[PDB]
Design a protein around this nucleic acid. Structure first.
Ligand SMILES: Nc1ncnc2c1ncn2[C@@H]1O[C@H](COP(=O)(O)OP(=O)(O)O)[C@@H](O)[C@H]1O
Lengths: 97, 85, 444, 109, 96, 96, 80, 109, 96
DNA sequence: CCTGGAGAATCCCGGTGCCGAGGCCGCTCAATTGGTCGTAGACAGCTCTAGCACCGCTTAAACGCACGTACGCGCTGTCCCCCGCGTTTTAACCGCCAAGGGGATTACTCCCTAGTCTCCAGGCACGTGTCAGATATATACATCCTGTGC
DNA sequence: ACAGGATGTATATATCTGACACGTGCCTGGAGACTAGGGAGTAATCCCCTTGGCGGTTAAAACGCGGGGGACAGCGCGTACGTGCGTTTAAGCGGTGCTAGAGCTGTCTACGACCAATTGAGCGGCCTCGGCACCGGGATTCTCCAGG
């Protein structure tokens, strides 16, 4: 009875919205916790400047977005609409991981 | 003597966040196993960058990681980042 | 020159020998055109004085313009009840709730302007800066004036940016750490008199500068009851494992970022650390009181409390210490309840009522030092223990007197544990320095 | 007397600090000696590149109905251009977002 | 007070005013432009130093800068930049 | 008669060429191609033998890597035959 | 000169593909691969010609080719 | 009078030329000054890397029934070791060939 | 006899004779090893120069070289190389 | 679904040529001494940022759930396309010879650049105020989805 | 196939705020003038390496043919995912409280690297030989493919 959108319209609207926006998508505090946990095993008792975490987050977003673009291209190459770990691993091996 | 744990920090990044990233990348439909793979990829990338940055900071004889160290690490990897000095 | 008793427009408000003088001082300050600070501390009718001041302005003067009273959230209902019950004629409105409710309130009452007094919390004030600045305010009342004790803060700058004619500060202890904060309060009060950062060189000049805009009174001057309280300072030595961890943290694999706070959760109980606890099993036996000096003394001292009048109120600084004492009490199977900031708001009042029931079998009541609602009538306690001391002697005093309510009949005796020759002594030394400064500045 | 000093930038008709470029070249440990015309050449090249990118960014800003240039406008200008996208291929611009790009297979039909 | 920090903000603003009189720029955009100028300067100077070492010279000259520009920039940009640099050096050498 | 199945000869060739190491493009045609390409940028150009050999080595290595990536893309598409679309996908992902 | 790209023959493309590790080859691969070779060679040769023009020479050297390859990220060992 | 000359290579026990490394470092224009121990450190690192690659290549050549190291052996040694392959991933070795590798799908059923 | 040219040929031969007493090398292999040594030296020296510039110092020292090798060489190679270099510098300091 | 045939690849011997390995000559770069000067190590005071243990509110965003639907995936049939082989033609490959440009070296000379001192004027840190860009509401418009009728 | 009904989205308008653009004051690095030295341009010489040509040979390519296998389109299905909704929570903001770690200007000082001249031995170039790699040949083993 209630009006419903098809499986794929809201996805396209979200794609348009997020390709139009420029902000960051991962949450700041979880990202900082992850960064500190990773840095701790390399060296203990580290202090991070608030600018360094932002730079790391920007680089992480850019890398993930480019990877997802290439993964989508591979999935379309395989005549599919979904992206899969096969596609991600293929894209990484082509890029030269 | 009390105990309580929350979660792992690799799970701190969430499936809706990964979906937002994929939408910005242009992906329409996503499989359910993409999320563990994405967490692995992000962890590897971060470990490389953090290793380089910590090496720079250790050479500087400092205890504080700086944006300049991060930028130098990214430039050495080949991912020149503008807007952070 | 002013009335010495309760005015007519306050119904069933008696103004017993302190509200009258306070109201006369407030009226005199308005006539002289200088803002004031009312610092009689918890125990006197500060709310009644402010309400009666507003009633005086509304009735004897014809200036019932835009009035704002800033209060914390927990006191909103109390202030509204006082407004509606003691000066019913001064009809007032309040702002509280989510964004849509704020829009409803502003569209229904605030913008139509039929309101006279608006009562709001700090957060709602910050959220409604642009929707509140449009009204030419006449009086600006800030209960718990020590909230704005620090400059360079959002609330302080926002309240400075408001267009107001006068203002009035309510606080218990205006001076906490140094004269910089009291200067901040005075600079907010008088916008231009105290713009600078600047026994006869001190004390005297401070008193004769602070006289024109401050009041300080004592309940016992006329109340003459509520027998005094004795503070027992118990020095306690640490255990061998405590000494070991003390040395390991002091010399420098765990995280050692803030050395002072690391030594803190270590002079209290090493089981707040990691690795002090035994192996994979969590065996709650002798991995307890018998491994920390403070806990040993506590286990020695509690049975005497059981054998005597009892009802030990416990004040701590760390919820981790609260949890470990909870484990100790369940190991000893003692009647207890735990209250802190993490406790849901509704879950706190029923706990207080249960502990204050005429027949309360509960023996241990744990509260954090600052995690109270600035109220908490714990008039049924008889023993108060300060397991830890903070850097705020004023906060310690307020936690002490929150159990010193009028209802109290048995004199409450305070305990203070100190680990001698450790960082606790430093903490107490800084606290004593601050307390002496605050006393010599304000109390006289 | 002493002739009034004329900056080498205005002497060569530039807007970039020729003297500062010479100092940076000499302190940069690139070579032992630096010619007189090398900093002038380099400053002119830098000015041309900066002017091109700023003009493209300003066109994008005017198209987006804002009179200020932001990093998103810079990213739009750097992409949408073959030469600039090749020069800045491996460069990440903070707060730049991505170009609108939807594959035609995904579009409904 | 503070330690002096040097950048290219003044010159970037002047070039922006020349190419678009009624147009502003944000602080982060200025940081991006500063980093861009620094990156291009470093690339061209490194190419010139490598050329000087390869040819067993010791002086970085206008010929080396031009060759480095042609190696770095992609084509039409390279030729336009070469024209700009030739005009600049000729104007600087003509009577000064 | 005698005839092999369609695909064993290819596998033997694969093994033979992955075991060998010598060049696989005719030297004189490659040299003529190089000279024809070099005619555009400058006339009356001369080459050394080592230059042509190095160019051939680099070109062959580039082509071999591209073909490996193309074979991977074809396998990903659940195919055995490689296609120009696979070549284009490999180029696009690698960044050209 | 002209018609020299066709000197790159189908059997040579097949041998290179087999060394790559492919089994079946489409008929349309060959002209695409020729175009790829043309663009790669043009880039490398252009950079080498820039180096030899700076050197004020008329003969292209293996060192010039190696310098071009290195600046394009395709370092070649074994020629100087 | 002077004592007999002792090379810094013999002082540090190395086989690579410390003096030549120092001269190249001074003349290569990497910094204004060079410490005494930097050439020694660099020569030791170069010697270690050469020893590793040469032992890998020699073992591979012995497995091939030959006593001469050739570019094929060098390529096999480099590409069969993960760390060296990462170090020389973007490097082409003349007359090296490729690693024998056939995808399992192409193998006959 | 033209102008003399230097290389690491004799040193590579000595290292080869140390590690494998009964193995020889060819001219192409020697050229490959010489180019490899030059490339590694260039990379390490450039990274050390950048480190010195970042830290605003005017010297290249053992700390700069060690940090450069830890940045360039991955993992186990870095640890072994650092150990070798530290041993060599210790023997040089003790023998001086 | 095993047999046996026919190609391909592997292994062992013997002969050739040449390139690697060694032995000398001569010089050019590295080692040894002595002197100095500045760069870096070490201290000191100010001031500013980060962290750790919390508290108090607020609310957007994450989390778990139900449900129907495109979608991924397996199986089939068709067809033509690519492969494998034999034939003929073509051009690479090899070796050899001749000619001349052009890279490479040496000797002169000058002009261009390092280095210094002096002066001053451009560029940087610091305040300060006003406009461009969020943000919030109420319209108006385009998109999509299903039921309705044909 | 086409209407209308709900939903998101764009546009106009008004408001507010904080960051950007400009002016001030002061200092430090760039410009003017000078000197001195050697780096690089310029001319001449040599000789090596490139180019051009020819002729015989043989592998390699081009071409045609025949046929089995892979590509591609179609069909069915059952399942993992996208969409909407209620519930929980953890992020984000605003606060305390203190202490260290590094950027700082200022300062001192000492030792380590640059520099110079001498001198000798290590390293490159050159010349010569023997064994290792290569190639051809013959016997042995392996793998694939058709038939019954
Ligand atoms: N009706 C009253 N008039 C004056 N003082 C009172 C009255 N009731 C209680 N008090 C005193 O006030 C104290 C509690 O009031 P309190 O919460 O301190 O008010 P406030 O928060 O305004 O200071 C008690 O100790 C009691 O002695």
């Amino acid at each position: 009875k209630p009006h419903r959108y098809r499986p794929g319209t809201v996805a396209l609207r979200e794609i348009r919205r997020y390709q139009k926006s420029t902000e960051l998508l991962i949450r700041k505090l979880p990202f900082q916790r992850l960064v500190r946990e990773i840095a701790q095993d390399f060296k203990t008792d580290l202090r991070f400047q608030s600018s360094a975490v932002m730079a790391l987050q920007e680089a992480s977003e850019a890398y993930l977005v480019g990877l997802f673009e290439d993964t989508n291209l591979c999935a379309i190459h395989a005549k599919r609409v979904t992206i899969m770990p096969k596609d991600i691993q293929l894209a990484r091996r082509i890029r030269g991981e | 003597r009390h105990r309580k744990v929350l979660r792992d920090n690799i799970q701190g990044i969430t499936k809706p966040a990964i979906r937002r990233l994929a939408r910005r990348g242009g992906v329409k439909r996503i499989s359910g196993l993409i999320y563990e793979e994405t967490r692995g990829v992000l962890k590897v990338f971060l470990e490389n960058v953090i290793r380089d940055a910590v090496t720079y900071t250790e050479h500087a004889k400092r205890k504080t990681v700086t944006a300049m160290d991060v930028v130098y690490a990214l430039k050495r990897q080949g991912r020149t980042l503008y807007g952070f000095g | 020159t002013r009335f010495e008793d309760s005015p007519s427009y306050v119904k069933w408000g008696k103004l017993r020998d302190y509200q009258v003088r306070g109201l006369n001082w407030l009226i005199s300050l308005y006539e002289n055109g200088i803002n004031g600070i009312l610092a009689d501390e918890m125990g006197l009718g500060k709310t009644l004085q402010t309400i009666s001041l507003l009633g005086y302005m509304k009735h004897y003067r014809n200036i019932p313009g835009p009035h704002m009273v800033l209060v914390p959230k927990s006191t909103l209902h109390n202030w509204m009840s006082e407004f509606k019950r003691w000066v019913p004629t001064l009809r007032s409105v309040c702002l509280i709730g989510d964004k849509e409710q704020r829009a409803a309130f502003v569209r229904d009452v605030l913008l139509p302007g039929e309101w006279d007094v608006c009562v709001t919390s700090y957060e709602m004030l910050i959220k409604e800066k642009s929707v509140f600045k449009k009204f030419n305010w006449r009086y600006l009342v800030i209960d718990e004036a020590h909230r704005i004790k620090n400059e360079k803060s959002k609330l302080s700058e926002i309240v400075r940016e408001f267009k107001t004619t006068n203002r009035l500060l309510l606080t218990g202890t205006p001076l906490q750490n140094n004269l910089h904060e009291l200067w901040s309060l005075l600079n907010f009060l008088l916008p231009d008199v105290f713009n600078s950062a600047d026994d006869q060189k001190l004390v005297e000049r401070l008193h004769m500068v602070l006289r024109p805009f401050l009041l300080r009174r004592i309940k016992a001057d006329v109340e003459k009851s509520l027998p005094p309280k004795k503070e027992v300072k118990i020095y306690v030595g640490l255990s061998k494992m405590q000494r070991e961890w003390y040395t390991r943290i002091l010399m420098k694999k765990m995280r050692l970022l803030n050395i002072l706070m690391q030594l803190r959760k270590c002079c209290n109980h090493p089981y707040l650390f990691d690795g002090a606890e035994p192996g994979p099993p969590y065996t709650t036996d002798m991995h307890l009181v018998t491994n920390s000096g403070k806990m040993v003394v506590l286990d020695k001292l509690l049975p005497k409390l059981k054998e005597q009048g009892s009802r030990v109120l416990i004040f701590s600084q760390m919820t981790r210490v609260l949890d470990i004492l909870e484990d100790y009490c369940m190991w000893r199977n003692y009647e207890y309840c735990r209250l802190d900031g993490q406790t849901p708001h509704d879950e706190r009042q029923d706990s207080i009522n249960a502990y204050n029931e005429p027949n309360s079998t509960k023996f241990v009541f744990m509260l954090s030092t600052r995690a109270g609602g600035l109220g908490i009538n714990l008039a049924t306690a008889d023993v108060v223990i300060l397991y830890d001391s903070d850097w705020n002697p004023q906060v310690d005093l307020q936690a002490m007197d929150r159990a010193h309510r009028i209802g109290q009949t048995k004199t409450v005796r305070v305990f203070r544990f100190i680990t001698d020759n450790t960082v606790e002594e430093r903490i107490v030394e800084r606290a004593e320095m601050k307390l002496r400064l605050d006393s010599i500045v304000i109390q006289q | 007397t002493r002739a009034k000093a004329k900056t080498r930038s205005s002497r060569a008709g530039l807007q970039f600090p020729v003297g500062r470029v010479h100092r940076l070249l000499r302190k940069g440990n690139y070579a032992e000696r630096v010619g007189a015309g090398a900093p002038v050449y380099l400053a002119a090249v830098l000015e041309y590149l900066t002017a091109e990118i700023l003009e493209l960014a300003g066109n994008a800003a005017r198209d987006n109905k804002k009179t200020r240039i932001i990093p998103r406008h810079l990213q739009l200008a750097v992409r949408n251009d073959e030469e600039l996208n090749k020069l800045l291929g491996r460069v990440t611009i903070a707060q730049g977002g991505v170009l609108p790009n939807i594959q035609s297979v995904l579009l409904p039909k | 007070r503070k330690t002096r920090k040097e950048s290219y903000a003044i010159y970037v603003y002047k070039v922006l005013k020349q190419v678009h009189p009624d147009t502003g720029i944000s602080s982060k955009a200025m940081s991006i432009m500063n980093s861009f100028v620094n990156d291009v300067f470093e690339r061209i100077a490194g190419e010139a130093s490598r050329l000087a070492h390869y040819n067993k010279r010791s002086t970085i000259t206008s010929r080396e800068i031009q060759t480095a520009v042609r190696l770095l920039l992609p084509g039409e940009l390279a030729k336009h930049a070469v024209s700009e640099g030739t005009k600049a050096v000729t104007k600087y050498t003509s009577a000064k």
